[PDB]
Amino acid sequence: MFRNNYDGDTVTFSPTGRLFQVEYALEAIKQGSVTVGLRSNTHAVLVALKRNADELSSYQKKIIKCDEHMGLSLAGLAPDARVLSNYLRQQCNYSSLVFNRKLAVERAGHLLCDKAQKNTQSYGGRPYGVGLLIIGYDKSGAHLLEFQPSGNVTELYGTAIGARSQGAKTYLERTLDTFIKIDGNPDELIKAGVEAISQSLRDESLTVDNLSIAIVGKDTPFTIYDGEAVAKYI
Amino acid sequence: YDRALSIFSPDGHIFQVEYALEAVKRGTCAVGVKGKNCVVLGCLKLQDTRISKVSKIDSHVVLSFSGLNADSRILIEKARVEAQSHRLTLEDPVTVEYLTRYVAGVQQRYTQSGGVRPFGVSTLIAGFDPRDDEPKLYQTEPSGIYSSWSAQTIGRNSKTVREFLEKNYDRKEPPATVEECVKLTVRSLLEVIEITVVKPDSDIVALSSEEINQYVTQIE
Amino acid sequence: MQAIADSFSLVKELQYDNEQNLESDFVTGASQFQRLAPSLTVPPIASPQQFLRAHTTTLAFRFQGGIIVAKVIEINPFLLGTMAGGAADCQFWETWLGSQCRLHELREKERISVAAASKILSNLVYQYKGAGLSMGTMICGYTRKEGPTIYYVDSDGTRLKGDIFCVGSGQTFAYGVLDSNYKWDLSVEDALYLGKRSILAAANLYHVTEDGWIYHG
Amino acid sequence: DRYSFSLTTFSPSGKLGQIDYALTAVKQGVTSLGIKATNGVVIATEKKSSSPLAMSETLSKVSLLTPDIGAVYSGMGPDYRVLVDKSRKVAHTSYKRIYGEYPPTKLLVSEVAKIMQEATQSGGVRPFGVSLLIAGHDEFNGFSLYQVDPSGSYFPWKATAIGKGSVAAKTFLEKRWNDELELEDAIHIALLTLKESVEGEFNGDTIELAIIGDENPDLLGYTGIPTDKGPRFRKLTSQEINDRLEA
Amino acid sequence: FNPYGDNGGTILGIAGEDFAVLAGDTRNITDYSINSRYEPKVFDCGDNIVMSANGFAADGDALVKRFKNSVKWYHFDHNDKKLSINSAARNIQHLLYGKRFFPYYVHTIIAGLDEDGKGAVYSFDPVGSYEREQCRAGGAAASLIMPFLDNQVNFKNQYEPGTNKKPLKYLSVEEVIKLVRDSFTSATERHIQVGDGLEILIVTKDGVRKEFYELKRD
Amino acid sequence: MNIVPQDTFKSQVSTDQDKSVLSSAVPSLPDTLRQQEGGAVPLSTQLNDRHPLESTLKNWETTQRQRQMEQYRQIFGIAEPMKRTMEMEIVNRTDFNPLSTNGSIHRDILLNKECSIDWEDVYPGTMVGDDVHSKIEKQLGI
Amino acid sequence: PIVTGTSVISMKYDNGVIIAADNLGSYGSLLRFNGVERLIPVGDNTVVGISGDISDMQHIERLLKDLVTENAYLEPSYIFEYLATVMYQRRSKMNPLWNAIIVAGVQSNGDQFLRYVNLLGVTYSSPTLATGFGAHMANPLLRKVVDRESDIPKTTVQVAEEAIVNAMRVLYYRDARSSRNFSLAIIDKNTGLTFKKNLQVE
Amino acid sequence: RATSPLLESDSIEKIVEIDRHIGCAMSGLTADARSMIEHARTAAVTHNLYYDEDINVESLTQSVCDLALRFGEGRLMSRPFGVALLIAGHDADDGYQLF
């Protein structure tokens, strides 16, 4: 009821301090499909259940690549995912051109945090309504960042985002003790990720078309496995 | 959902453009008829007659209108400026399709911001391409839609005059003589006179207020 | 506000604040390869022209069958351009012209008039008139309405039409030998013969038709 | 955000609401009045103060626009102050800097009216909540007195009054005005009108009065250019005003 | 202030059948002073493209860095599609002519394979005229490099002995490499700027190979 | 932190650099009729041998303003220049008036030019494109 | 260029790099300002030596302190790449920094780093680098100690240091703008950065 | 679709060429379709000019959708387009494909 009055913009607080308009953008992630990410100390893995609009249609590209060291996973609004991915990749590039240094994953995440915060406070725009998982490998080792479109970034061993991510995240919470030690045997980390994303499934099963995987590590630049390359892990 | 151009209706309508079409529906009626060799356009006591609603945009292309007169006059001025700008930048006179496309673009441009009113005018553009003799007739709408027509009517009585033309025109036996086009035009108007005849090679005549066609059609 | 604030919030020295610089160096995407009318760098000085300064025979005539022209840039399957002056400037601006023509034909759904194309060319060359762009493209084509059409275009922005154009080192010999024979009512192979004779007097053939230009070797 | 909607708009009656409300703000303001004589103009007003601790010598309600032109107002003092600043600036920029001479009163009034009108079109600002009485002399138009309203309309007046007392003052002026007044007669009539219009203490420190008259070379501040003209605007001192009140 | 200089050194593109060779000396010069004896003058740009912007060294570095970045963007946009040598040439043309009134004071050559796998060499004017070419020398000793090779890979102005033209031959990649070697040896023998070493990039359908050969240090 | 305007010459030139005045027929060349400059004859290449002062006098006030904002950033921090600029943009963006040439009365107060004259005040200095509609389209970006 | 710095000389050695500069700014022929330190250590692993306009020197030194202050939120190679980019963009702005700069240091992998850059953005590596008059007089002497990159592992720190001091002596003998006082820095992969101020030719 | 029999069906133009191997059929608010088609044509010709290579149909439709983004952050437009485009073409990369 009274929420209807105080929810018209990102610029009105309610009498309870809620800032509903940001909450609605955080709910916009729950409309996204599930994706899982996890890392060991030497390798980082992303797993995503793609979707297609109709049986006549191809599956949408849910994972991307900033550079040969870091990559990204999307859930939520496609236009905002496009914006943020272009932004993260234009920062990765400018960093390389001007300094010839791989942009630190943590720095890239902080840059996303900053970009996302602006839309939460000016009247005219809107919050990005999209969650991102960032993985990379640099001097500091393997990284996994979860980005929320409120402008919050956390470095995690594993997480899930999307409609039923709670299942996969509960599974990971039971098993983090196991996957973080998986060093130099990335195949077992990928299979652990596919297991984690085998929870939170509903009326569906993982298939070479609907499932996508990527990996990066000390010995392994960011590579995406999709289609027949995923059959090794299903 | 009515009070901005930016707002889609839940059923996908932009009501603020339909209200500009309703604004067109109130403007004084304009009629246009293509022949095979010509296009015909037609539509207080103390008025000073010496100081027509049919406006030449270039020697080969003509624009009539219906709706708000001042909006029409602004859009006519812009069309004239574009015609001369094309004739300067490129040696060829404007295509009639190029002119109507420009006019519809201008009308669309005044639809692309909630801070500006769209032109509440529909235009009837008639003429011939340079070095060509296919008669072309077009309508533009407040949305910046445009369409090619064999005959059309806009404004206050466009419904009945169009329903008349839909039966007295024949798509495969069109009027094949200037007098036949003028006859059909006057007949359509007499359902509710001024007539302009445009001919190839930049020949245009306001038809002298010849009542002969009126008397003949009243005899018929 | 925040945008204003961030204007007051290392990139100044290498000038990667400048948007057009970011584009030129392909920081802000490939946008430099996404613009018509390519942007040209000018030296940031009070006298750019001073800093810049401090850095064949061909023939055409109109006839019954079309035009024969005798380095002829294929602007389009219906337009030919005699590269003349600076080869870099010719290659670049004729490729740009061909793209403008393609856009015109797409939008208007007609083959561009040779008059229109030559006017576009002369206008652009004029706009850069006085800064490089040594240029002498003779523009040749056929259009259903226009028929056979010839326009010369110059670095100085001259534009001129005529039934015969003779250009290059033997231009006066070619012109003299042609005028001794030229006619409107030439037969096709007769016009080819007269053309070859007039080039030989000045020592490629291209035949220009409603269905496009043809190369006769 | 590229546009701001017009804050002043016509009502279905055809009346521009913000203009009516600015004229109401004028009606709410303290009385001021002016009177053309044959040989001058008077402008006068009450120095209403929020406290007796305020320095009345800083309540400059009457202000010089040119040596020959002065203004007074009723309503929002800050708006009057900004309008005075702008009118002085425009008197210099538009006219003195072009023609080498001060504008005639008619044209400075027209410039003030133009400035006030444009606040009625803008979608960023309200209109000014003041009306100004502008009195001045011109070499050709002679002495003149104009009333400028929040709309930016102006009319020439023989005498007028604005603010709370406006109607009763205008009736007293209409009965007492005549085409033969001398400047001392106009000053006396002005003082009697304000005595009838003022509320509470009526003294030379609760009033101020300025005149447009003959040149005052003792106010010119230099000597020896005999064609050069002393200011015709002159504010009366509260001493002189009290010496008038003892009449 | 003069915004240009001459850094000397030389480059040489040779197009084979299934290969292309791009060679350059590694000496860097200013005036009569040797700045360094080993700057890599020729660069692998990826996509089996090799490049060198000979001339003013700084503008060459700028142009090759802009090109490599443009290739990165080409890959991003077109999902790692191999940039074709003709598309690379058109890119470098637009990079060059964008400087039309403040040009990169460099002559640049790219070598690669076309979509047929045929050896390709392109050379570009500092204002971006370009041609497909079978061989091209560049830099100060280009006039020394080229005529010998035009006499040894081509047989121009040669005739069959007493039969007053001898036919041209296809050459193996190592044989043209050996001819580049000998040519640069002769040029360092006679031209003071031709560097202390010769670095050769060999483009093949298997990828690019780098070879380096020492030359006289004086 | 500049006294004399430094950055005062265009680094890049294109036929399309001038927007809002482009040919509709060929969106790569100027519209010389709408320019009303006396033809194409004011070709952009003729922007040469400019008066040495002009490139500094046009943008003197802009440079003074930028120095002032810089000084406020150095001494008062990012808040003060932000506030000043936001106020100024609010004034500029809300004052639309296609008929008046005169500067806004509040703009002068913000600039502290209430009691200042300059030659731009004294000397404030067409068949196509002068109309109110051209100003509307410029201001809204139609 | 009003106040100018004389010359920087440097060489790499088996475990590191040595760089030296004559600590003097000349006002034309007037040796106006002494004690103008022209070697700028930029963290533990690199020293940027700058020559030419001392005012432009102090502007590049503050650009470098700005670089370090931002990184605190470096390899020698990164500092060089930034410097070279600034230099070249200033050149293309037609507003050069009238300086020649050598970025000396050791990469975190232990590779010696030496690059020259000048107001033009011309860049090159070598076993030995010198700027200005040092490029003509000092470079011949250092190139006698390390002529080629195979000589690097043969060249001890003691010999490289004695060579640098000898080259500074020769510069003092034969460069009219040289001071007798100079500063020398040793950047060693094992012992780190040693920065010997106010050495004298003797 | 025809509002009336007097409308010339030969000028409705619901299918347009974008490039020699790429076409597009419109539906919806035709003015927005015109704007998208003009953008797509400009993109295609520019890609030809700069890369000597006809645009990949996927890259074309990517550019078209990048335009449709610009009702929000890349703002240009008061509202999203009221038009869907159905882009069909052929390229040497992926052959016949429909978007």
Place this chain on the structure above:
Amino acid sequence: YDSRTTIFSPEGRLYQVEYALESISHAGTAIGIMASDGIVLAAERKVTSTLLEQDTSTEKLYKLNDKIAVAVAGLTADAEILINTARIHAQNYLKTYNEDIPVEILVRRLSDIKQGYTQHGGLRPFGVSFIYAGYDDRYGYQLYTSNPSGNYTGWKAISVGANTSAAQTLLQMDYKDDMKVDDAIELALKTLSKTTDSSALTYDRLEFATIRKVYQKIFKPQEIKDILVKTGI
């Protein structure tokens, strides 16, 4: 729907412009009459009082040029903004072509100016309608009016302001196009005398002008009084 001038109502009508039109129904009547040998302009000074300087209140009739004058009804501030814009336009035209501006070109420019303020949302319509009297050697004597909507029309005789319907009916009955200027003056005075809400058409309540012969005269109140008593009012 009426809150701002840029919004069409569902009926397709611009209430804000109809309200700007209705604003003129409260301005004192102005009237203009074109004769065979000149044009008459007259207007009621509805804002009147004995303390107003009638002798210097030129307040409804303004000359924009030689051979052109305007009569104003509505907001005098907007009126004088438009009058000064039109004066500047006429002088720019004379400066460019060295010929006096045609009357219709000036009317068109002013009507386009008035129209534009109805089309941008940060502007209101001008609450003013002009009658234009002038002469040019193309159309000779010609007379126009224009509305807040920025449409205009040519008229032989026209009335604007409060009682325009009555005045226009009296014109339609009494006007004949072969009358002389001296006849049109009396027809104007009759019309205003029968139209005014005043008890009597006292000379101070009138402003009067004529364009004839080419010369234009704005009457001082003395000759206004004489023309009145000559007419018999």
Place this chain on the structure above:
Amino acid sequence: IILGIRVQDSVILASSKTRQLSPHTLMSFAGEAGDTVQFAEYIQANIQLYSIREDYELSPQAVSSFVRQELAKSIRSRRPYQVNVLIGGYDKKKNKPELYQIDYLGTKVELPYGAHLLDHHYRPDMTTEEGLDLLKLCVQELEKRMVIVKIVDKDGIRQVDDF
């Protein structure tokens, strides 16, 4: 070369080009290539725009004033290009010919004849036949010292093959 003669009935113009500004107004010009023709065609487009907007021919005096103003405005921004213009028109309102010359600085003067001898020949009362004879004489003396021909008339503009 350009030449013009004002006659009792017509204006006669000659040149070794020209643009028709209106049915009763003709422009001829000489000067630098490109600059001169770009100017002449901008002028032509402006006069055509005016004629369309008003449905009325601009008089020859107003046309020559417009060309003067546009030439001065053209020079203000750039180096003066060498151009000279003859404008020959029949004033249908005054019912007489008028000829104007405009120099490269925008100096405009009404002339009985001009070019870019005849004082021994020219008479204001000449007919267009006498004018064409005087033109022939002038061209004969020009060829002794080392054309297209137009007439402007009540009936508009005329080509003359008797060059």
